[PDB]
Amino acid sequence: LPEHWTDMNHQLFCMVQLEPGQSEYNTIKDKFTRTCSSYAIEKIERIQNAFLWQSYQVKKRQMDIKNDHKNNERLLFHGTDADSVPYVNQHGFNRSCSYGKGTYFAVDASYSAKDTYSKPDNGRKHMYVVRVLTGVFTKGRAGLVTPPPKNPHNPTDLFDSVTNNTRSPKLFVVFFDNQAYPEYLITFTA
Amino acid sequence: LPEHWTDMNHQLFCMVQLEPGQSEYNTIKDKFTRTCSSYAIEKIERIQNAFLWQSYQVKKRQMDIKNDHKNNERLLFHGTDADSVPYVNQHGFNRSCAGKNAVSYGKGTYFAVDASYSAKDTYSKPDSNGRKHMYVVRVLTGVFTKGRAGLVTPPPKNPHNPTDLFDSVTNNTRSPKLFVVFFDNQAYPEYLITFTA
Ligand SMILES: NC(=O)c1cccc(N)c1
């Protein structure tokens, strides 16, 4: 449904390799090279997953209504191993597969570039650029299974995400499916 | 939002007490009493949760497209403790908080075909006033297989295509008595039955 997606022959899922030197590739490469200029990019792919996008956009609309502002989305990074890539492309990020038991996303590509996250393949590494509905956030802590409530006497009204540091966040954790949309996959080497 | 819901003015959540003798109440009562005739219903509430409904209906439409038929949905029961009711009413069922079943077919949220299963004190734990609580739930069971205790998602239909998954798992494919779901917004809590011995 986004305007910049290309035609999919009436299908619902496609990975589209970006053309180097065009505006879309350049924009994503720049976000990566801001902190990972010593790495070599092999390719960048746009993830066109209609079902995942639809469920994510429903959640975004709901969060925009609940927070009655539209500053709920951030573009973050997520490094993972090659064996998780097919699952993420098709199903997104699953907390069931410390600041809480959720899925973690980094502000800086350099954080996700650590081998503990983007585990090397032939030494190929994989990192997603992710639209994340961080919404209203608070500091996380170990053992959380959802974000904390905003106020005790209303324990069901929750923060949207948690972070390591509210003033200068470097990571965010989300605890529900469809709060994160994998937008691009970067394949790269050290 | 469904046309039979009460108008919520500009609200996104409401519980609606049903009246006995109407078909909506009586049919839920009949489904419950089919296996829970020793218990007595205090009340039945319709759960009107706009956001949960929207996200669930999106998943249902997607599953109906994927499976190329239209019986992916079952009406099942879920007994729980009073302390979980506010959360479920607002946020639905969360696999990360789910109880461990006495016979585990995976790490997910469990739903019963028969109210008698959910009526056990192990699940619908009596509160300090003797009230037990059971949800009636639209569940997207889709295509299913027999589960296994280690599962954190449904298994693949084919081991050589690991991402093409069953929609849910069960205890027994020939005579299913319980279903386990592993994703958010795959189950919509539609009614809450409050009942007693
Ligand atoms: N890239 C990751 O998987 C990641 C991002 C932020 C924090 C953590 N722990 C991991």
Short mmCIF file of C-alpha atoms and ligand atoms in Angstrom, two decimals:
data_model
loop_
_atom_site.label_atom_id
_atom_site.label_comp_id
_atom_site.label_asym_id
_atom_site.label_seq_id
_atom_site.Cartn_x
_atom_site.Cartn_y
_atom_site.Cartn_z
CA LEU A 1 0.00 0.00 0.00
CA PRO A 2 2.83 2.61 0.31
CA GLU A 3 3.37 4.64 -2.84
CA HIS A 4 7.02 3.62 -3.27
CA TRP A 5 6.34 -0.12 -3.39
CA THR A 6 6.56 -1.72 -6.81
CA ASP A 7 4.03 -4.00 -8.50
CA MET A 8 3.67 -7.55 -7.18
CA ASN A 9 1.60 -9.24 -9.91
CA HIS A 10 -1.44 -9.47 -7.58
CA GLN A 11 0.63 -11.17 -4.84
CA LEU A 12 1.02 -10.19 -1.20
CA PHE A 13 4.71 -10.71 -0.41
CA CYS A 14 7.89 -9.80 -2.28
CA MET A 15 11.46 -8.84 -1.40
CA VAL A 16 12.65 -6.14 -3.83
CA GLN A 17 16.39 -5.51 -4.21
CA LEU A 18 17.06 -1.78 -4.41
CA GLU A 19 19.06 -0.19 -7.18
CA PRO A 20 22.27 1.42 -5.87
CA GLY A 21 22.62 5.14 -6.46
CA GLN A 22 18.90 5.90 -6.54
CA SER A 23 17.19 7.99 -3.88
CA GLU A 24 15.66 5.16 -1.86
CA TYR A 25 18.87 3.12 -1.63
CA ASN A 26 20.87 6.25 -0.87
CA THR A 27 18.56 7.22 1.99
CA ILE A 28 18.79 3.82 3.66
CA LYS A 29 22.53 3.53 3.07
CA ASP A 30 23.08 6.94 4.68
CA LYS A 31 21.15 5.95 7.81
CA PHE A 32 23.40 2.88 8.12
CA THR A 33 26.68 4.63 7.27
CA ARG A 34 26.07 7.36 9.86
CA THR A 35 27.44 4.83 12.37
CA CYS A 36 28.67 1.90 10.21
CA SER A 37 30.85 3.58 7.57
CA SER A 38 33.56 0.88 7.91
CA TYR A 39 31.19 -1.90 6.82
CA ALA A 40 30.58 -2.97 3.22
CA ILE A 41 26.98 -3.15 1.97
CA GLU A 42 26.30 -6.03 -0.40
CA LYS A 43 22.64 -5.19 -1.02
CA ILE A 44 19.54 -3.55 0.42
CA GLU A 45 16.10 -5.08 -0.05
CA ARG A 46 12.68 -3.53 0.47
CA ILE A 47 10.31 -5.85 2.31
CA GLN A 48 6.86 -5.72 0.68
CA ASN A 49 4.69 -7.71 3.09
CA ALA A 50 1.09 -6.60 2.61
CA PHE A 51 -0.42 -8.51 5.56
CA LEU A 52 2.27 -7.42 8.04
CA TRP A 53 1.96 -3.84 6.80
CA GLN A 54 -1.82 -3.87 7.15
CA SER A 55 -1.73 -5.10 10.76
CA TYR A 56 1.04 -2.61 11.60
CA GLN A 57 -0.90 0.30 10.10
CA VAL A 58 -4.00 -0.66 12.10
CA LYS A 59 -1.90 -0.50 15.28
CA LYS A 60 -0.39 2.83 14.21
CA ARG A 61 -3.84 4.35 13.64
CA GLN A 62 -4.96 3.10 17.06
CA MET A 63 -1.88 4.49 18.79
CA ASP A 64 -2.32 7.81 16.99
CA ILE A 65 -5.89 7.95 18.35
CA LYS A 66 -4.93 6.80 21.86
CA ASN A 67 -2.03 9.25 22.19
CA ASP A 68 -3.89 11.91 20.11
CA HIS A 69 -0.65 12.86 18.41
CA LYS A 70 1.11 11.35 15.41
CA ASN A 71 4.66 11.21 16.78
CA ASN A 72 4.50 7.51 17.63
CA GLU A 73 6.83 5.93 15.05
CA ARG A 74 10.64 5.73 14.93
CA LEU A 75 13.00 4.14 12.41
CA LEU A 76 15.32 1.73 14.25
CA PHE A 77 17.70 -1.16 13.52
CA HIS A 78 17.61 -4.86 14.35
CA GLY A 79 20.47 -7.27 13.75
CA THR A 80 19.69 -10.97 13.54
CA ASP A 81 21.13 -14.26 12.33
CA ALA A 82 20.65 -15.48 8.76
CA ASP A 83 18.43 -18.35 9.87
CA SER A 84 15.88 -15.90 11.32
CA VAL A 85 15.72 -13.78 8.15
CA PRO A 86 12.98 -15.79 6.35
CA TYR A 87 10.78 -15.74 9.46
CA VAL A 88 11.19 -12.00 9.98
CA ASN A 89 10.50 -11.19 6.33
CA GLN A 90 7.21 -13.13 6.48
CA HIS A 91 6.05 -12.76 10.09
CA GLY A 92 7.96 -9.87 11.63
CA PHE A 93 9.48 -9.82 15.10
CA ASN A 94 8.33 -12.34 17.69
CA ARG A 95 9.15 -11.72 21.37
CA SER A 96 8.69 -15.45 22.06
CA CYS A 97 11.69 -16.35 19.89
CA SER A 98 17.65 -6.71 30.19
CA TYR A 99 14.86 -4.18 29.80
CA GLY A 100 12.04 -6.69 29.41
CA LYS A 101 10.95 -9.78 27.46
CA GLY A 102 10.18 -8.06 24.17
CA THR A 103 11.85 -7.42 20.82
CA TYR A 104 14.78 -5.00 20.89
CA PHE A 105 15.56 -2.25 18.40
CA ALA A 106 18.62 0.03 18.29
CA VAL A 107 18.87 3.73 17.52
CA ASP A 108 22.34 3.27 15.97
CA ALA A 109 23.16 0.71 13.30
CA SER A 110 26.53 0.22 15.04
CA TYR A 111 24.74 -1.38 18.00
CA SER A 112 22.92 -3.87 15.77
CA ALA A 113 26.18 -4.46 13.84
CA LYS A 114 27.64 -6.34 16.82
CA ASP A 115 28.25 -10.00 16.00
CA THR A 116 26.06 -11.02 18.95
CA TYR A 117 23.04 -9.66 17.01
CA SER A 118 23.87 -9.67 13.28
CA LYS A 119 25.66 -13.00 13.56
CA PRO A 120 27.99 -13.59 10.57
CA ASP A 121 27.02 -16.23 8.03
CA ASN A 122 30.68 -16.76 4.43
CA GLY A 123 30.92 -13.80 6.83
CA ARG A 124 27.68 -12.08 5.76
CA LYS A 125 25.69 -10.10 8.34
CA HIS A 126 22.03 -9.07 8.31
CA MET A 127 20.30 -6.02 9.77
CA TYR A 128 16.76 -4.69 9.36
CA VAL A 129 15.64 -1.08 9.19
CA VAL A 130 12.38 -1.19 11.12
CA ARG A 131 9.38 1.10 11.60
CA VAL A 132 8.68 0.81 15.34
CA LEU A 133 5.64 2.18 17.21
CA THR A 134 7.56 3.39 20.25
CA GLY A 135 4.75 5.79 21.22
CA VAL A 136 5.02 6.99 24.83
CA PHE A 137 7.90 5.22 26.55
CA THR A 138 9.43 4.80 29.99
CA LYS A 139 12.56 3.19 31.41
CA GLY A 140 12.47 -0.60 31.25
CA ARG A 141 13.74 -3.23 33.67
CA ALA A 142 14.33 -6.96 33.75
CA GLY A 143 11.38 -9.31 33.79
CA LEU A 144 8.76 -7.03 32.24
CA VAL A 145 6.36 -8.92 29.97
CA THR A 146 4.42 -5.75 28.86
CA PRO A 147 5.35 -2.07 29.32
CA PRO A 148 4.47 -0.78 32.78
CA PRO A 149 1.21 1.09 33.39
CA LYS A 150 1.26 4.86 33.27
CA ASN A 151 -0.49 4.97 36.68
CA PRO A 152 -1.14 2.37 39.43
CA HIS A 153 -4.89 2.88 39.95
CA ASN A 154 -5.30 2.26 36.18
CA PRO A 155 -3.02 -0.76 35.66
CA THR A 156 -4.37 -1.47 32.15
CA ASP A 157 -3.41 1.88 30.58
CA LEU A 158 0.13 1.04 29.45
CA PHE A 159 3.18 2.73 28.05
CA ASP A 160 3.78 1.78 24.42
CA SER A 161 7.43 0.74 24.78
CA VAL A 162 10.41 0.88 27.13
CA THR A 163 13.97 2.15 26.72
CA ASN A 164 17.34 1.99 28.48
CA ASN A 165 17.42 5.77 29.00
CA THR A 166 14.45 8.10 28.53
CA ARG A 167 16.55 11.24 27.99
CA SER A 168 18.99 9.75 25.43
CA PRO A 169 17.54 6.43 24.29
CA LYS A 170 19.76 3.96 22.51
CA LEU A 171 17.39 0.99 22.46
CA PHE A 172 13.64 0.40 22.55
CA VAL A 173 11.68 -2.73 23.48
CA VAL A 174 8.16 -3.51 22.25
CA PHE A 175 6.03 -6.30 23.68
CA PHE A 176 3.29 -6.95 21.11
CA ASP A 177 3.13 -8.34 17.60
CA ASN A 178 2.61 -5.83 14.81
CA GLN A 179 4.23 -2.89 16.70
CA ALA A 180 7.22 -3.26 14.35
CA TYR A 181 7.35 -3.48 10.56
CA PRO A 182 10.58 -4.73 8.91
CA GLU A 183 11.03 -2.20 6.10
CA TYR A 184 14.47 -2.94 4.65
CA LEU A 185 17.02 -5.74 4.96
CA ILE A 186 20.70 -4.77 4.72
CA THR A 187 23.19 -7.50 3.86
CA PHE A 188 26.71 -6.41 4.75
CA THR A 189 30.22 -7.43 5.84
CA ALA A 190 32.76 -6.12 8.35
CA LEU B 1 -17.96 -2.03 14.46
CA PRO B 2 -20.76 -4.61 14.54
CA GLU B 3 -24.26 -3.17 14.21
CA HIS B 4 -25.62 -5.14 17.18
CA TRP B 5 -23.25 -3.38 19.58
CA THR B 6 -24.56 -0.61 21.79
CA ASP B 7 -23.58 2.83 20.63
CA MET B 8 -20.59 3.72 22.78
CA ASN B 9 -20.81 7.48 22.04
CA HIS B 10 -17.11 8.38 21.76
CA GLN B 11 -15.74 5.46 23.78
CA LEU B 12 -13.58 2.57 22.62
CA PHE B 13 -14.47 -0.03 25.26
CA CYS B 14 -17.67 -1.14 26.99
CA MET B 15 -19.06 -4.23 28.74
CA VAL B 16 -22.76 -4.79 28.05
CA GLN B 17 -24.89 -6.85 30.43
CA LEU B 18 -27.16 -9.21 28.48
CA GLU B 19 -30.81 -10.00 29.30
CA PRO B 20 -31.96 -13.61 29.85
CA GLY B 21 -34.63 -14.75 27.44
CA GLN B 22 -33.01 -13.01 24.48
CA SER B 23 -31.43 -15.32 21.93
CA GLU B 24 -27.97 -13.83 22.49
CA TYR B 25 -27.93 -14.69 26.22
CA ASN B 26 -29.83 -17.96 25.91
CA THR B 27 -27.57 -19.39 23.21
CA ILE B 28 -24.43 -18.68 25.27
CA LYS B 29 -26.19 -20.15 28.32
CA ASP B 30 -27.11 -23.27 26.32
CA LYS B 31 -23.52 -23.70 25.06
CA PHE B 32 -22.23 -23.40 28.64
CA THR B 33 -24.85 -25.64 30.28
CA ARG B 34 -24.31 -28.40 27.68
CA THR B 35 -21.32 -29.44 29.80
CA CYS B 36 -21.67 -27.23 32.93
CA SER B 37 -25.19 -28.06 34.13
CA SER B 38 -24.09 -28.23 37.78
CA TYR B 39 -23.10 -24.53 37.76
CA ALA B 40 -25.32 -21.45 37.70
CA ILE B 41 -24.73 -18.30 35.67
CA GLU B 42 -24.74 -14.98 37.54
CA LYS B 43 -24.49 -12.83 34.39
CA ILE B 44 -23.23 -12.70 30.81
CA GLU B 45 -21.57 -9.56 29.45
CA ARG B 46 -20.84 -8.72 25.83
CA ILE B 47 -17.33 -7.31 25.42
CA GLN B 48 -17.21 -4.34 23.03
CA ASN B 49 -13.53 -3.54 22.48
CA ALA B 50 -13.08 -1.53 19.30
CA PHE B 51 -9.32 -1.83 18.92
CA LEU B 52 -9.15 -5.55 19.72
CA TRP B 53 -12.03 -6.18 17.30
CA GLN B 54 -10.37 -4.23 14.47
CA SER B 55 -7.06 -6.06 14.82
CA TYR B 56 -8.78 -9.45 15.13
CA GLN B 57 -10.96 -8.84 12.07
CA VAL B 58 -7.87 -7.94 10.03
CA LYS B 59 -6.24 -11.25 11.03
CA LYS B 60 -9.43 -13.12 10.17
CA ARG B 61 -9.65 -11.58 6.72
CA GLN B 62 -5.98 -12.43 6.14
CA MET B 63 -6.45 -16.04 7.29
CA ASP B 64 -9.56 -16.42 5.12
CA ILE B 65 -7.51 -15.25 2.11
CA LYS B 66 -4.53 -17.47 2.96
CA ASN B 67 -6.51 -20.65 3.61
CA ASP B 68 -8.91 -20.14 0.67
CA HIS B 69 -11.93 -21.16 2.71
CA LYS B 70 -14.01 -19.55 5.42
CA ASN B 71 -14.02 -21.87 8.40
CA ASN B 72 -11.00 -20.67 10.26
CA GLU B 73 -12.97 -19.46 13.30
CA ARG B 74 -14.34 -21.39 16.27
CA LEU B 75 -16.21 -20.24 19.38
CA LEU B 76 -14.29 -21.59 22.37
CA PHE B 77 -14.05 -21.09 26.14
CA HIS B 78 -11.30 -19.73 28.38
CA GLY B 79 -11.45 -19.87 32.17
CA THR B 80 -9.31 -17.42 34.09
CA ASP B 81 -8.86 -15.77 37.47
CA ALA B 82 -10.54 -12.53 38.49
CA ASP B 83 -7.18 -10.73 38.60
CA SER B 84 -6.69 -11.26 34.82
CA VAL B 85 -10.15 -10.03 33.79
CA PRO B 86 -9.39 -6.27 33.54
CA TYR B 87 -6.34 -6.94 31.36
CA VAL B 88 -8.08 -9.42 29.06
CA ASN B 89 -11.09 -7.12 28.65
CA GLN B 90 -8.82 -4.31 27.40
CA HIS B 91 -5.88 -6.11 25.81
CA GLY B 92 -6.96 -9.66 24.99
CA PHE B 93 -4.96 -12.77 25.75
CA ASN B 94 -1.19 -12.57 26.08
CA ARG B 95 0.77 -15.78 25.48
CA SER B 96 3.67 -14.39 27.53
CA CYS B 97 1.44 -14.46 30.63
CA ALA B 98 -0.33 -17.76 29.92
CA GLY B 99 -0.64 -20.46 32.54
CA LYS B 100 1.12 -23.79 32.05
CA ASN B 101 -1.48 -26.39 31.09
CA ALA B 102 -1.56 -29.73 32.92
CA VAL B 103 -1.11 -31.31 29.49
CA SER B 104 0.97 -28.88 27.47
CA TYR B 105 0.74 -28.83 23.67
CA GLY B 106 2.81 -25.64 23.41
CA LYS B 107 3.60 -22.31 25.05
CA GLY B 108 0.56 -20.29 24.08
CA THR B 109 -2.99 -19.32 25.08
CA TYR B 110 -5.35 -22.25 25.57
CA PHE B 111 -9.02 -22.43 24.54
CA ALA B 112 -11.45 -25.25 25.30
CA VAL B 113 -14.19 -26.78 23.16
CA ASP B 114 -16.20 -27.70 26.29
CA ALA B 115 -17.07 -25.22 29.04
CA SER B 116 -16.55 -28.01 31.60
CA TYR B 117 -12.82 -27.91 30.93
CA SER B 118 -12.63 -24.14 31.50
CA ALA B 119 -14.96 -24.45 34.54
CA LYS B 120 -12.29 -26.30 36.54
CA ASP B 121 -11.05 -24.29 39.53
CA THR B 122 -7.55 -24.63 38.05
CA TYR B 123 -8.57 -22.15 35.33
CA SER B 124 -11.69 -20.21 36.41
CA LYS B 125 -10.31 -19.76 39.91
CA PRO B 126 -13.08 -18.85 42.39
CA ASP B 127 -12.65 -15.36 43.76
CA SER B 128 -13.17 -14.49 47.43
CA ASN B 129 -16.96 -14.28 46.79
CA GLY B 130 -17.10 -17.64 45.01
CA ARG B 131 -17.46 -16.13 41.54
CA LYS B 132 -15.79 -17.92 38.63
CA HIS B 133 -15.07 -16.28 35.27
CA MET B 134 -15.04 -17.76 31.78
CA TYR B 135 -14.68 -16.01 28.43
CA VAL B 136 -16.43 -17.07 25.25
CA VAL B 137 -13.92 -16.34 22.52
CA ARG B 138 -13.81 -16.17 18.73
CA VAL B 139 -10.57 -18.01 17.96
CA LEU B 140 -8.85 -18.26 14.57
CA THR B 141 -7.97 -21.93 14.71
CA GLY B 142 -7.53 -22.15 10.91
CA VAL B 143 -5.55 -25.23 9.86
CA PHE B 144 -4.17 -27.13 12.85
CA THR B 145 -2.07 -30.10 13.89
CA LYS B 146 -1.29 -31.89 17.14
CA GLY B 147 0.89 -29.66 19.32
CA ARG B 148 4.01 -30.35 21.40
CA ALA B 149 5.15 -28.89 24.71
CA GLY B 150 8.22 -27.15 23.26
CA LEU B 151 6.39 -25.00 20.71
CA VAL B 152 6.66 -21.22 20.91
CA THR B 153 4.90 -20.76 17.49
CA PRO B 154 2.84 -23.31 15.52
CA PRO B 155 5.00 -25.76 13.62
CA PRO B 156 5.57 -25.55 9.87
CA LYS B 157 3.31 -27.61 7.65
CA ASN B 158 6.43 -28.75 5.76
CA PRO B 159 9.88 -28.92 7.42
CA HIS B 160 11.53 -27.69 4.21
CA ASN B 161 9.46 -24.46 4.21
CA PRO B 162 9.88 -23.43 7.86
CA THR B 163 7.89 -20.17 7.60
CA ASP B 164 4.60 -21.56 6.19
CA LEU B 165 2.94 -22.36 9.53
CA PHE B 166 -0.11 -24.10 10.86
CA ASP B 167 -2.48 -21.54 12.36
CA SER B 168 -2.95 -23.29 15.71
CA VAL B 169 -2.35 -26.62 17.43
CA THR B 170 -4.64 -29.03 19.25
CA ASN B 171 -4.50 -32.00 21.62
CA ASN B 172 -6.01 -34.40 19.04
CA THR B 173 -6.82 -33.64 15.40
CA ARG B 174 -9.57 -36.27 15.16
CA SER B 175 -11.42 -35.13 18.31
CA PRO B 176 -10.10 -31.70 19.30
CA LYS B 177 -10.85 -30.59 22.84
CA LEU B 178 -8.42 -27.69 23.14
CA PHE B 179 -6.66 -25.27 20.81
CA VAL B 180 -3.50 -23.26 21.43
CA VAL B 181 -2.77 -19.96 19.70
CA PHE B 182 0.63 -18.26 19.60
CA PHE B 183 -0.03 -14.76 18.21
CA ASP B 184 -1.66 -11.58 19.43
CA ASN B 185 -5.06 -10.68 18.02
CA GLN B 186 -5.79 -14.31 16.97
CA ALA B 187 -8.56 -14.51 19.61
CA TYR B 188 -11.31 -12.01 20.42
CA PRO B 189 -12.91 -12.22 23.90
CA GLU B 190 -16.56 -11.76 22.99
CA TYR B 191 -18.47 -12.63 26.18
CA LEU B 192 -17.60 -12.92 29.86
CA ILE B 193 -19.63 -15.45 31.87
CA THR B 194 -19.65 -14.91 35.63
CA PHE B 195 -20.92 -18.00 37.40
CA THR B 196 -21.00 -19.88 40.70
CA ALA B 197 -21.43 -23.34 42.16
N1 LIG C 1 19.92 -5.30 16.87
C1 LIG C 1 19.40 -6.02 17.99
O1 LIG C 1 18.99 -7.14 17.87
C2 LIG C 1 19.37 -5.29 19.31
C3 LIG C 1 19.07 -3.94 19.31
C4 LIG C 1 19.02 -3.25 20.50
C5 LIG C 1 19.27 -3.93 21.69
C6 LIG C 1 19.58 -5.28 21.69
N2 LIG C 1 19.85 -5.98 22.94
C7 LIG C 1 19.63 -5.97 20.49
#
